[PDB]
Design a protein around this nucleic acid. Structure first.
Lengths: 262, 206, 143
RNA sequence: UACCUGGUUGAUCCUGCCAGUAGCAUAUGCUUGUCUCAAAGAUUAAGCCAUGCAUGUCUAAGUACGCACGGCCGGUACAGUGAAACUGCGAAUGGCUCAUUAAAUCAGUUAUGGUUCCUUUGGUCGCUCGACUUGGAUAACUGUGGUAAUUCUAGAGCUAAUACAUGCCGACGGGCGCUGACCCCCUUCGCGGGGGGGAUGCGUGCAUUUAUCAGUGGUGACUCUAGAUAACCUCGGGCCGAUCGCACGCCCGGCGGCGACGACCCAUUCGAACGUCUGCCCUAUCAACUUUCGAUGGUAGUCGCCGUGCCUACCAUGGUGACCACGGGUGACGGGGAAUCAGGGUUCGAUUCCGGAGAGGGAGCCUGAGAAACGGCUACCACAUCCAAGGAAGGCAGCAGGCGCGCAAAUU
RNA sequence: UAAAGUUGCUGCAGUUAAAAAGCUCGUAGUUGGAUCUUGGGAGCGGCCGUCCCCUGCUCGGCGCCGGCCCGAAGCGUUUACUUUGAAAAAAUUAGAGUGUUCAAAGCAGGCCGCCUGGAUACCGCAGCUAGGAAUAAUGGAAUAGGACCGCGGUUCUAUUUUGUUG
RNA sequence: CGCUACUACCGAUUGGAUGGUUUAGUGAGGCCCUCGGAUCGGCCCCGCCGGGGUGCCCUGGCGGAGCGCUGA
RNA sequence: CAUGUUGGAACAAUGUAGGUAAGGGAAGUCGGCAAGCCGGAUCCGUAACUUCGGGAUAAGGAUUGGCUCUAAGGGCUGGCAG
């Protein structure tokens, strides 16, 4: 423990990647990026087992280093690149794309899109800075300083910049009823709306999140993203359609696809 | 080596801690700079994270801001007079943070003449016959002498800087760390601060 | 009065040495929703470990205790009574962690038995990691 | 599955223990057809150890004339591979063991607005008003030289550079501030007086220093972030690209599409470290403990990556405990866990995952972003192999294998 | 380890089987009397179950003719207790889920391209979050320094203003 | 009281052997500071000679100093 | 006061009274006899045993010079000044 780790055991590998215990004995202690070890599904497993492109460490490495994987306007050639939330992934050979959303369960949204949807990203700031001669600057969820923002964009708010240039087009200012996405824990992707705002100065600011079916609960302001306004998303969704089915109703419809489907 | 460990010493209650591990590198001590007033002798020291830290060992250059009108010129350091930390750090003339050091008035005497045009001190009877300051104290343009009329009524000297600028000795202070940065930058004592650090010297007199 | 000490006690922001023709005091607000008193700003005392008129930021945990001692200077001993649940014997036991707390000197008359408010910060000293944020006067003290 | 039976008596009812009964996990006894996963030198000795290896590694991207091979079109250098060298990056990951350690370690828990961080990623890379590309040596190569050597080791003759080092065109033409020749207007008698140009003397980016003056984005909350002003700058000074691969036009020394690197810098990621709150086995045949030689505070520093009696200085006299402090003990690494289990409980966790700790014992340090490292070094103390008897070399608690130990644990 | 209710929290025992200090005093510790919001008001259920209530006002609307209320909001003795929610490594364990053909494992595979798994509870305490206010704390006015109303006074001093200038 | 067999106890032995903490004394080895200065390169005025602007000079094959100055 | 009832010149033995000894250290001897060591003060630290008085200067350690400052420790006259 006198330097950084370079192995990471497969029994100690995080469960949300959905690797086994027996095949693997180690895990990607990744060559890093703008999102965390826990908070990413790395580009190796997002490739090699969740559409099952690649097999072995030979097979995975022979895709990345060619400059193929068209990550948000600059191809980067790392198998272990941490791809989190509100970045843009694009594939340039198969004819495939991705927007990075949370599905309502522990794992992320494994969902294919078009290049048109892979043209705008919704960069929520984590704080706002001012530079060395009174020039404003930004600190986002993806830690981006792409400056000259809108004066009605504050910390809690999400901005919309264009990928090709990095200049603001739209934003989502903090308003009650904005389409919500809780980026925490087991509510890690509740596709609902903000239904209330109340204060916790010093503690963690309470924002009640209503899922479309009128599901009343709360999470701290830290890990609540807003995907758009009211009912209409600015982004294409994964399956489930933001309901968070309980353990009861996983026996209801999933067995109903055994009666009339076979 | 000399460590900054929290575990080598006693608990709240009194009972001594027992060491569970030998000393680590990050828990580190290097000897005090004990930086004299001499020519600019500075050894660099590598520190944690692969950065430099400039050890002043002898140092007499650094800028001091005359706080009232806020003028600052890099001046020679001549005498450590007071230190509240230890009365013996004055003796073995060591520059630390909050050392009340003497500097020259001549860079600021220059500036006050080059801005306001008023000669201070120089016991009554003493003109300047070689004459650099007298034509800096007379003979301007016709109507921008009224600029010196709008800068006369509210440019009166401090109570006890009339008796400092006269002798060419300003009680300055050190507000950097010369054992960490290798500079001796700070400010000039004024007002109640000047009536404190001079009270600490004349009370010793009698 | 004040400045019967060695080094010049001052606030490292304000000035007091300009040409004229009652020193200007700097304070701040603290967060959580606490009030700096009249006594802090009306008075002329000079202290650096206060969350209001000094260099320390209150963050993390905010706790409460009851004052037991004021025989130290600029720091008080408070006491935190709590019950500890033992799972076998389905009952409790009295324990206390009499934590070391800095006495934010804006509070003029604090007695023993006063319910204090303490906020976690960076360590002021070896054992002190807390400041005084409000105080309630004793049950009477009519005379 | 929430359970009992034998035993004191001449017989009795009882308190009561011993003994059965059943797992479980160390050995051991005798016996061992099939196959499957599968423990293993934990317990006694963190006792001692006979070879070797696991940390270095070569590409379209600093760098390349080894004649080391080998292609031809040569004089516009460098073909294209491959070796030491090194700009640099790895040996700090692992693996092993459980000796110390009793609010330690550690767990959940929040903190850094107290900090550090090559890699990886966001980025900024003519902002300052004062070069068509440079230094003079070095490395490998190479020859000569000894010393038993051991991964031991000088001198000569050449010499490359995101080294070792210096640095200039351009942007650039001003604006940005003072002292100001000078002129435009004059009211009242001249002086008192109210407003714009304008030669020119100076100074003017990005991190570190104080202070003045209002407060432009921001968090629950600044001494954040700033605006700017006086301007301040370590020969042991921050940068201001003396870089590369392959394409490459219009052209007779200029323009440009896509890579490359590293810093000043802020913003990450992997972390690290110090912190908050609550929690642990036995012991009163341990009742007071700690303290002008740091105890608990202050205040100024010192130093450190930063917060702190972390360490000094002069003050105050605290802190802790009958809610068991402190002291002593542990066949005590902690936890995730394990065995048993009506319900509660009780014992166990050295062992594969995580956190810490150690490399015979201590202690000091170089290097690096990161060790107080031992498959680094320097000692002292113990152990111990060479010796040509002058003087060298060494760490298995990494993997086998000895030796000692034992009831107890495999193939060099 | 269970049997062991022979360590007894649930759950032992102390007249004579082992055991109550000889005896009171007594400090922490432990435990501590009763007592402070009551019934009907308002619709439905098949006389009476359930529901809805009897706390305070700088911003904004189904609005509206100096002004009538309602939603966002800074702010309403504290503590325990209880409920929910937040977050809370896998491995093991219980097991939704699925035929290692059995079993323990395992996030496998399944149907002649597509479909689906990779959840969930628990995680003593301790922290956080929003209710409930029974239970036990613990307060508020006693030579009233008293809750509540607008006044007489005494200073710092927001800005709406004294034609631009002071 | 007397045999036998183990088991702890006390006991002269200023008994013995061990871990851990510690004041006192001498103190290895590093690190830091202070000098050091072995060596290793320079810069100058000139000596022997050159090549061109013009006995004055800017670039030089080659020797010697006050080590004058300067650095690793 | 005139070196104790005399002087001068020699500096052998052996005496009497002083000292000093390399390495060892009580082997000397009836016996550590004689000699030696230790020695003051400040400042630490102080056992067995006890008639709780002591033991005790137990034992066992540290500093000490010179010179130069600094702080602290007082009268007096009518929280002060002289």
């Amino acid at each position: 423990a006198r330097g950084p780790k370079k192995h990471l055991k497969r029994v100690a590998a995080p469960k949300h990647w959905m690797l086994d215990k027996l095949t693997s004995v180690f895990a990607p202690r990744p060559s890093t990026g703008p999102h965390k070890l826990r908070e990413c599904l790395p580009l190796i497993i997002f490739l090699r087992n969740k559409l099952k492109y690649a097999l072995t460490g030979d097979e995975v490495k022979k895709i990345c280093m060619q400059r193929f994987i068209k990550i948000d306007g600059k191809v980067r050639a790392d198998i272990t690149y941490p791809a989190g939330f509100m970045d843009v992934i694009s594939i340039d050979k198969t004819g495939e794309n991705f927007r990075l959303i949370y599905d309502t369960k522990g794992r992320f949204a494994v969902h294919r899109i078009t290049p048109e949807e892979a043209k705008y990203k919704l960069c929520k700031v984590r704080k706002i800075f001012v530079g060395t001669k009174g020039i404003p600057h930004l600190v986002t969820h993806d830690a981006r300083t792409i400056r000259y923002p809108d004066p009605l964009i504050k910390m809690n708010d999400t901005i919309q910049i264009d990928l090709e240039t990095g200049k603001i087009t739209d934003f989502i200012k903090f308003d009650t009823g904005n389409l919500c996405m809780v980026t925490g824990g087991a509510n890690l992707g509740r596709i609902g709306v903000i239904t209330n705002r109340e204060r916790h100065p010093g503690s963690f600011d309470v924002v009640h999140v209503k899922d479309a079916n009128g599901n009343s609960f709360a999470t701290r302001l830290s890990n609540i993203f807003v995907i758009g306004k009211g009912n209409k998303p600015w982004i294409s969704l994964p399956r489930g359609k933001g309901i968070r089915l309980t353990i009861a109703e996983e026996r209801d419809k999933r067995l109903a696809a055994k009666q009339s489907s076979g | 080596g000399i460590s900054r460990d929290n575990w080598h010493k006693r608990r709240k209650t009194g009972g001594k801690r027992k060491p569970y591990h030998k000393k680590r590198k990050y828990e580190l001590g290097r000897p005090a700079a004990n930086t004299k007033i001499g020519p600019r002798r500075i050894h660099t020291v590598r520190v944690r994270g692969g950065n430099k830290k400039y050890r002043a060992l002898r140092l007499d250059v650094g800028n001091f801001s005359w706080g009232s009108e806020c003028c600052t010129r890099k001046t020679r350091i001549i005498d450590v007079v007071y230190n509240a930390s230890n009365n013996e750090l004055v003796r073995t003339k060591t520059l630390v943070k909050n050392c009340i050091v003497l500097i020259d008035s001549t860079p600021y005497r220059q500036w006050y003449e080059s801005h306001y045009a008023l000669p201070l001190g120089r016991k009554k009877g003493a003109k300047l016959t070689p004459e650099e300051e007298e034509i800096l104290n007379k003979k301007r343009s016709k109507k921008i002498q009224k600029k010196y009329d709008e800068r006369k009524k509210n440019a009166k000297i401090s109570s006890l800087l009339e008796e400092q600028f006269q002798q060419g000795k300003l009680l300055a202070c050190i507000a950097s760390r010369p054992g960490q940065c290798g500079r001796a930058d700070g400010y000039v004592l004024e007002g109640k601060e000047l009536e404190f650090y001079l009270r600490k010297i004349k009370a010793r007199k009698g | 009065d004040i400045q019967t000490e060695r080094a010049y006690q001052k606030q490292p922001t304000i000035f007091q040495n300009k040409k004229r023709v009652k020193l200007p005091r700097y304070y701040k607000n603290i967060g959580l929703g606490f009030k700096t008193p009249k006594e802090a700003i009306e008075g002329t005392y000079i202290d650096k470990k206060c969350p209001f008129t000094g260099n320390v930021s209150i963050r993390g945990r905010i706790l409460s205790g009851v004052v037991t001692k004021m025989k130290m200077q600029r720091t008080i001993v408070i006491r935190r009574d709590y019950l500890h649940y033992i799972r076998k014997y389905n009952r409790f036991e009295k324990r206390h962690k009499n934590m070391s707390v800095h006495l934010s000197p804006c509070f003029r008359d604090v007695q023993i038995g006063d319910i204090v408010t303490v906020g976690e910060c960076r360590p002021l000293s070896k054992t002190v990691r807390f400041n005084v944020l409000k105080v309630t006067k004793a049950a009477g003290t009519k005379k």
